[PDB]
C-alpha cells in the first residue's frame, strides 16, 4: 500500500526553478545538485529531464541505489519570477553514469514512460472512435480533444510502442499533440491560425509593458521542412478504385488508407521559422501563442517585416544552473 | 512494418460485406485475440473469372503488399506441414498410408 | 517579357575574384560581400556558391526579400591574375538564414537545378541514341560529348531526379561527367589518360617558369576506393543465358542490364591520389591535364617518385575572403 | 623459398613495449618512430596496429615503398616492466597516407586478415561437427576450445567474410571469441563465471602488494546493452510446429534455425561495467579475470560497494610515445 504524507517543515528554503527532489520519503539536499535541464517537446517524445548531481562521498548510487526504475519526486516551479507557475511529476531514471565525483541522472516522465513500453501481445480496435483508442491505451492522463470527427480501425502489433498508434491518430485527425503537466492535448492546426496571443515578447524596446528576448534567431530555410510534404496522395479502394487528394502539379505518391478524410490531412505540419532565448519564464508552455515585435538596432530604427506578428510555441527548454535561470524556445506558423 | 511472407490459418469465410474474403489468423503474432477482431484478406487468383473456395482450419501463406500495412493482407497459396507424423499431401502421392481403394 | 540591357558606367571598380552581384537590375555594393565560395566538383552535382553578406541595417532580407526562388546573377572572372578567364551565371537560392547581423546564401546553378527537380510525370526513351536523351532532358545546354557508340532504352520514374538518367548514360558510355560554364560534357575514359598536360605545377623550385603549389596532401589509399570496384558482373538474358563479363577470380555480383559493352564498363573509374592548394588560379577546371614535379626540401634534393608525371582534375574549390584569393584542388590518375 | 635467418647481434637497444619493426629482413630505425597503437578487441574482429613514422627526407614511402600489401615483422613485449612477456606476430598494411612530413601506417593482423577476406565461391559444411569447420575454415591458428557439443549445418555464401561462420558458431555454442598471439579462442560463458582471478587491482591503497588504477569510469547504463537481448524466441520446425524459447513475459521475435540448444543460448553476453587505465602492464588479454578493490578518497575511507569483486577483460589498448608507456581496460560481469 501507499499513504499520502504531508510535506515536512524543515524546508525552509525557496529556489528559482528547481524547488526539491526526493527519492520516496527522503530528500537529496538541494546544495548539492548543480545542474537542471527541463525539455517539453511538441511532440508525443515526452517530458525529459537530466541532473547533474556532485557526490564525492559516493554517497548518492552506493548507499542510495540509484539505478535503472529508481523514481524521483521532483518539484518545479516558480512562485515568485516571471510566471508564478508550480507542479510535482515524477520521473523514472533510464540510466546514472558516475564520473569526475559527479553522477548524471537521465529521467523520463513515468506517465509517458508508461506509454513508450513496447508492447507483448498485440491490440486490434476495429470501428472504435478514438476517445475510447485513447483512454484504453493512456488511462492515466487527462484528455483535452477537440478534434474528433469520425470513426475508424487501429492495430497495434507485437514490440510496436503505443504512441505510434496515437502519432497515426493525430495525422489522420490534423492536430498536433504533447504531453505535458498530467494532460495528453489534441489540438486542431486550422483552429489554432485564429487564436488570441496570450504573452508580448519585444526586442530593443527598454520601455515595454512586456518581456524581453535577449537572443533570437531568424530561419529562412521554408523549403527544407516543405520538401517532404510536396506530395499528391493515392491510394486503392476496393469500391471506388484508385483515390487521389492533394494538388494536380506534384509528384504522386501512395499510402493504404482509403479515406477521403485522412487523405486530406495527410500533409499539414507547422513551419518553423524563430528561436529565442529569454530570462527564464516558467508559463512557456507548447500551444501558446505570442505577438512579437522587432525593432532594429542601427541605420533608423525600422520594424522587421521578416518576423510574423502571431507566432506558436512548438519546443521549450528550461535550464539552471547555480546562478541563473534560462528558457529557450521554437517558435513556428502553421502552413 | 511487415515486408516477407507469413504462415496463418483460415477462420472463416463469411464476409459481413459480400466481397469475396477470408477471415485470416498470423501463426505466432496474432496470438490472443478474439475471432471478431482479426482482419479479412484477399486472395490472387489463378485465372480470369475463377473463385476456389477455402475451408476453415487450411494453412496459407500471407503477405502484406499495400506498404506493409497488417489491415489488407493478402493470400498468396498453400503451405505444406508435417506435424501430424505425416505430409498433408495424400497417401498415394507419399506412401505413409494406405489410400483409396476403388470397387 | 525580358529585356537586355547594356552595363552600367558607374561600376568602375575591378576585384580579384567577385566582381559583381545583382538581383534582376539592381546591384547589391560590393563591399558588403565578405565571403565567397565557389565549388566546381566532377560530377553532376553541379556547381554551388555560397555568400556570406553582413547585413547590420536589416536591408538584404527585409526590403530586398531574399528567399526561396530568388535568382542573382553573379560575374566572375580574373582578368589580371593567373588565368584571366572572366564568365557570368545564374544562381538560384534555397535558403538564407540570418545571425548575428549577418545573412548566409546558398545557392545553386540555374541550368543544374532544373535537372534537379523531381519529376511530376514518367517518361521512358525506347531505342534512342543517347544524343536525342541528352538533348531533351537538357535542352539549355551546349553538349560536348565524343563516347557515344550504341543506342539502347532508357526510364525514368515518377519522383525520380533527370540527373539519375544522365549518369546511368555515363556509366554505360564510360566516361565522366561534369557541367560548368554553359556546357555539358561527355568525356571517354580510354583518350584520356593519353592526353598530353597544359600546365606546369612545382613545389620547392623557386626558379620555374610555371607556377607554384604551397601546400599539398600525399594519399596512398587506394584500395579504399578499389575495394567497391573489384566484382565480377553478371546478368541473365532470355535468348544468351547467363553472361559473365570481368576478371575471373573475383566474386561474382548481379545486375540487370545483360548489354556487353554496358557491362564491359561496369568498373571504370578515377582513383584519387593527390590534394593541393595553390594561390588563386580560376583557369583549373575539372578535365583538366597538369604535369607535377615535387622536390624534397632536406637531405640531398631528391624528387619524389611517389606522385606521378600527369594528373587530372577531379574537383576545384575557389575561396575569396576580404584579403587573399586562394583555389584548391583534388587530383587523380584513370584506373 | 623462405630462409629462417638468425637475428642480428647490432641491435643492442632495450626498448619499453615496441622492440624493432623489420620489413623482410631490413629494419626501419627504431627512433624514428613516434607513435604506437596496439589494440586487442574481445571479438572476432582481429587486433589492430597504427605506426606514426617520422619521414622528412621521403625514405619510407618513396624508397622502401610502403603500400597495400607490404608486411611488416614487429616484436612486442615488455621483458623489464610490469609484464614479462614476448613475442613476435605479422601485419598487414592497408594504407599508408602522408603528411607533414610524417607517415601513418595502419595495419592488420596477417592470420586474422586472411579471415577477413570476401569469398570468391561458396562453400557449405553439411551435418560437420564445428572442428572440422574451424580447422577448414583457418587452418593456420591452433584452437583452443571447450564448449563444442553437437553436429550442424553451416552456410557461406559468395561475397561474405568466413569470420560470419565464426561468429554464428559462436552464438549456437554460447562462447566468447578472440584471436591474438597465434591461437583462437572458444570460451563458454558459464564457467567463466566461476573462474578464480589472477591479478589484484586497488585504488586509494598506498601499501598495496598488487598494482594501482590512476582513472577509472563507473558505467551505470545496464539497459542500454539488455535492451537488445530482452526478447522471447520463436521458430518454425517442420515436424514439431512452433518452437518457443525464453521468458513467458517478453515480446516475440522470430529467427529461422528451430534448435533448441542454439535457441537457448542466443541471448547470452557480458555486461560492460567499468573502464579504467593503468600503467602499462602487457599482461592484459581478454579472458582475463581480476579482482577490484576501490577505497573513497573523502569522507570515511568507505569501500565502494557498486563495483562487484571479479570482472573480465574485455577489451584491452596499448598505447607507447615517446616518453611514456600506458594501458586502458574495458571490464564487465557475464549476464
Excluded at chain 1, 102 to 115: E, G, K, M, Q
Excluded at chain 1, 285 to 304: C, M, Q, R, S, Y
Aim: with cysteine.
Amino acid at each position: 500500500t501507499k499513504t499520502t504524507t504531508a510535506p515536512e517543515t524543515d524546508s525552509k528554503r525557496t529556489q528559482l526553478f528547481l524547488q526539491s527532489v526526493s527519492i520516496g520519503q527522503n530528500e537529496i539536499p538541494r546544495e548539492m545538485i548543480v545542474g537542471c535541464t527541463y525539455v517539453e517537446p511538441g511532440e508525443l517524445s515526452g517530458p525529459q529531464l537530466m541532473l547533474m548531481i556532485r557526490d564525492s562521498t559516493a554517497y548518492v548510487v552506493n548507499k542510495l541505489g540509484v539505478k535503472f526504475g529508481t523514481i524521483l519526486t521532483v518539484s518545479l516551479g516558480d512562485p515568485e519570477g516571471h510566471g508564478g507557475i508550480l507542479f510535482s511529476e515524477e520521473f523514472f531514471v533510464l540510466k546514472a553514469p558516475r564520473k569526475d565525483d559527479t553522477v548524471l541522472i537521465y529521467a523520463f516522465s513515468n506517465p509517458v514512460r508508461l506509454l513508450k513500453v513496447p508492447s507483448t501481445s498485440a491490440q486490434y480496435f476495429v470501428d472504435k472512435p478514438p476517445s475510447a483508442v485513447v483512454s484504453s491505451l493512456a488511462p492515466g492522463l487527462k484528455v483535452n480533444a477537440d478534434s474528433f470527427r469520425k470513426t475508424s480501425t487501429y492495430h497495434l502489433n507485437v514490440g510496436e510502442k503505443p504512441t505510434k498508434v496515437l502519432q497515426e491518430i493525430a495525422r489522420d485527425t490534423g492536430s498536433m499533440c504533447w504531453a505535458s503537466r498530467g494532460m495528453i492535448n489534441f489540438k486542431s492546426m486550422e483552429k489554432m491560425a485564429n487564436a488570441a496571443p496570450s504573452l508580448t515578447y519585444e526586442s530593443a524596446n527598454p520601455n515595454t509593458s512586456g518581456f524581453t528576448i535577449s537572443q533570437f534567431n531568424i530561419l529562412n530555410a521554408d523549403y527544407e521542412y516543405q520538401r517532404r510534404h510536396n506530395y499528391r496522395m493515392a491510394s486503392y479502394d476496393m469500391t471506388k478504385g484508385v483515390v487521389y487528394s492533394g494538388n494536380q502539379e506534384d509528384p504522386i505518391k501512395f499510402t493504404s488508407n482509403p479515406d477521403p478524410t485522412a487523405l486530406a490531412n495527410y500533409n499539414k505540419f507547422i513551419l518553423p521559422r524563430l528561436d529565442m532565448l529569454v530570462e527564464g519564464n516558467a508559463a512557456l508552455t507548447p500551444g501558446t501563442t505570442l505577438k512579437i515585435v522587432v525593432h532594429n538596432t542601427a541605420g533608423d530604427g525600422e520594424l522587421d517585416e521578416s518576423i510574423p506578428d502571431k507566432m506558436i510555441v512548438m519546443s521549450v527548454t528550461h535550464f539552471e544552473d547555480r546562478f541563473r535561470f534560462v528558457s529557450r524556445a521554437q517558435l513556428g506558423v502553421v502552413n | 512494418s511487415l515486408t516477407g511472407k507469413y504462415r496463418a490459418v483460415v477462420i472463416s469465410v463469411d464476409d459481413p460485406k459480400g466481397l469475396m474474403r477470408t477471415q485470416i489468423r498470423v501463426v505466432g503474432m496474432m496470438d490472443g485475440l478474439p475471432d471478431a477482431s482479426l482482419p479479412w484478406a484477399e486472395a490472387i487468383l489463378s485465372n480470369a473469372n475463377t473463385f476456389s473456395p477455402f475451408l476453415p482450419g487450411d494453412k496459407v501463406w500471407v503477405e502484406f503488399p499495400y506498404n506493409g500495412d497488417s489491415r489488407w493482407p493478402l493470400i498468396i497459396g498453400y503451405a505444406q506441414d508435417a506435424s501430424g507424423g505425416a505430409p498433408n499431401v495424400p497417401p498415394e502421392a507419399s506412401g505413409q498410408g494406405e489410400g483409396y481403394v476403388p470397387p
